[PDB]
């Protein structure tokens, strides 16, 4: 007889990726703490567009 159903891969993938680029995120939206970015610079540029979904730290 033969038997041996072996083959299970555990899920593993950091939840830190720049929404804009995608490579890697270092910072995070200081308004909702959901949108990740590789740096404030990437946030400011992807902010005026992102904020269109989140409230934000300041309303102006
Ligand atoms: Zn980026
Ligand atoms: Zn946000």
Tab-separated table of C-alpha atoms and ligand atoms in Angstrom:
chain	number	residue	atom	x	y	z
A	1	UNK	CA	0.000	0.000	0.000
A	2	UNK	CA	0.965	3.634	-0.522
A	3	UNK	CA	-0.093	6.892	1.135
A	4	UNK	CA	1.367	10.246	2.130
A	5	UNK	CA	-0.545	13.406	1.253
A	6	UNK	CA	2.210	15.861	2.177
A	7	UNK	CA	2.350	19.363	0.733
A	8	UNK	CA	1.285	22.410	2.730
A	9	UNK	CA	2.815	25.853	2.210
A	10	UNK	CA	2.329	28.362	5.029
A	11	UNK	CA	1.249	31.819	3.869
A	12	UNK	CA	3.933	34.465	4.382
A	13	UNK	CA	4.010	37.969	2.902
A	14	UNK	CA	4.720	41.211	4.762
A	15	UNK	CA	1.811	43.656	4.598
A	16	UNK	CA	4.049	46.629	3.810
A	17	UNK	CA	3.998	47.769	0.181
A	18	UNK	CA	3.901	51.285	-1.265
A	19	UNK	CA	0.471	51.762	-2.840
A	20	UNK	CA	1.933	54.124	-5.438
A	21	UNK	CA	5.011	52.189	-6.558
A	22	UNK	CA	4.536	48.798	-4.930
A	23	UNK	CA	8.166	47.827	-4.387
A	24	UNK	CA	8.421	48.696	-0.692
A	25	UNK	CA	6.730	51.085	1.738
A	26	UNK	CA	8.546	52.937	4.519
A	27	UNK	CA	5.961	55.526	5.558
A	28	UNK	CA	2.177	55.528	5.946
A	29	UNK	CA	-0.688	57.968	5.403
A	30	UNK	CA	-0.773	60.181	8.497
A	31	UNK	CA	-4.532	60.462	8.099
A	32	UNK	CA	-5.976	56.952	8.034
A	33	UNK	CA	-2.869	54.837	8.625
A	34	UNK	CA	-3.905	52.522	5.791
A	35	UNK	CA	-2.170	53.795	2.657
A	36	UNK	CA	1.485	52.743	2.572
A	37	UNK	CA	4.253	54.668	0.812
A	38	UNK	CA	7.985	54.303	0.171
A	39	UNK	CA	8.364	57.769	1.663
A	40	UNK	CA	6.529	60.974	2.545
A	41	UNK	CA	7.506	62.285	-0.889
A	42	UNK	CA	5.525	59.462	-2.493
A	43	UNK	CA	2.675	60.200	-0.085
A	44	UNK	CA	2.372	63.914	-0.855
A	45	UNK	CA	2.145	63.091	-4.563
A	46	UNK	CA	-0.200	60.153	-3.976
A	47	UNK	CA	-2.052	62.083	-1.272
A	48	UNK	CA	-4.198	64.628	-3.112
A	49	UNK	CA	-5.405	61.518	-4.940
A	50	UNK	CA	-5.593	59.088	-2.018
A	51	UNK	CA	-7.181	61.529	0.432
A	52	UNK	CA	-10.083	61.292	-2.017
A	53	UNK	CA	-10.948	58.131	-0.087
A	54	UNK	CA	-9.728	58.879	3.437
A	55	UNK	CA	-10.400	61.831	5.742
A	56	UNK	CA	-6.843	62.913	6.486
A	57	UNK	CA	-4.895	64.584	9.314
A	58	UNK	CA	-6.055	68.069	8.324
A	59	UNK	CA	-9.045	69.380	6.372
A	60	UNK	CA	-7.868	72.110	4.018
B	1	LIG	ZN1	6.231	54.847	-3.632
B	2	LIG	ZN1	-5.135	58.113	4.023
